[PDB]
Paper text:
To achieve the stabilization of a specific conformation of the hormone, we developed the strategy of inserting a covalent bridge between specific sites at the B24–B30 C-terminus of the insulin B-chain, i.e., an intramolecular side-chain:side-chain crosslinking. The evidence for the structural impact of the crosslinking in the analogues reported here comes from three crystal (analogues 2, 10, 11) and two NMR (analogues 8, 12) structures.
This was examined in the next analogue, 11, in which the azido precursor at B27 was clicked with propargyl at B30. The full insulin IR-A affinity (103%) was regained in this analogue. The full IR-A affinity (103%) was restored in analogue 11 by expansion of the crosslink from position B29 to the B30 site. The LysB29→Gly mutation removed also possible side-chain interference at this site. In contrast to analogue 10, the crosslinked-loop is not in the plane of the B-chain; instead, it bulges sideways to accommodate the longer linker. However, as in 10, the cyclization within the end of the B-chain did not interfere with the dimeric properties of 11, allowing this analogue to maintain a regular dimer interface, and to form a typical R6 hexamer. Moreover, simple modeling of the B24–B30 segment of 11 on the insulin in the IR-A complex leads to an even more optimum conformation of the B27–B30 crosslinked-loop of this analogue in relation to the L1-domain and the αCT-segment of the receptor. In this model (not shown), the C-terminal part of the B-chain in 11 passes under the αCT-segment and folds back to embrace that segment on the other side of the αCT helix.
Author numbering:
A (entry chain L), C (entry chain J), G (entry chain D), H (entry chain H), J (entry chain F): 1 to 30
B (entry chain K), D (entry chain I), F (entry chain A), I (entry chain G), K (entry chain C), L (entry chain E): 1 to 21
E (entry chain B): 1 to 27
The structure:
């Protein structure tokens, strides 16, 4: 089941907010 | 990585602030 | 208004879906 | 970058892919 | 700007919730 | 359609159900 | 739990982005 | 897993839509 | 409350409305 | 145009994350 | 259909396009 | 209220933490 995919969708939204103008890297493997 | 840390158990704001640039 | 900030939320979700396992860097304004 | 391009006019998913690692 | 695109994203989420088992068509 | 009706002003749940199958 | 409901919500958003002007039909079950 | 936390994100959005101008209170677990 | 009710099985929009102010 | 409605959708998601187990009240125009 | 196909395992963009109009 | 404050200009995490219970 796509649990990790669903989690990541919400994680990137949370990083967008928390990081703001600093920005962020997202890559699932590492 | 973030997925191992934060999809297994919930990450705090302080912890999420770790994947910022 | 905060429309550019709202757009960015949707853009990160779109990049999440398109990039998959490759990941991405995101930062508003660069 | 991506905001100036893709929040002004709609980006295709091929355009978006240019911003992937 | 892309506001009609943005609004349409929220509309399809709303139809998903409201329509339930009926589903919907979006074009 | 729904974009004209429901992005120019807020649609109720009942209004939105016009677009269900 | 409601995971098939949650996944459907993400599917709708993905079809919105992928299908573009084509649009889509969504009806759970078929 | 973080599935209950993910569910909550969707629930808040659903309440936002259903309650409209009435508003709501939300807190996980009560 | 709402999580125990509506994250275990799907709540209708009538059930959800019970949690509005 | 529904700008305030679109903004609020994102605001409630941001409150959900920032407030976590504390929870929050949301009611437009107050 | 799409739930069975694409919630049991990840679907590509091309897989998802089967469900477009 | 939060709409006046946060839909006119972007709210910080500190500012959002004001509408928490
Ligand atoms: Cl989810
Ligand atoms: Cl928006
Ligand atoms: Zn939006
Ligand atoms: Zn989700």
């Amino acid at each position: 089941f796509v649990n990790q995919h669903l989690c990541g969708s919400h994680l990137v939204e949370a990083l967008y907010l928390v990081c703001g103008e600093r920005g962020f890297f997202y890559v699932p493997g590492a | 990585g973030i997925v191992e840390q934060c999809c297994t158990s919930i990450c705090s704001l302080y912890q999420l602030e770790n994947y910022c640039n």
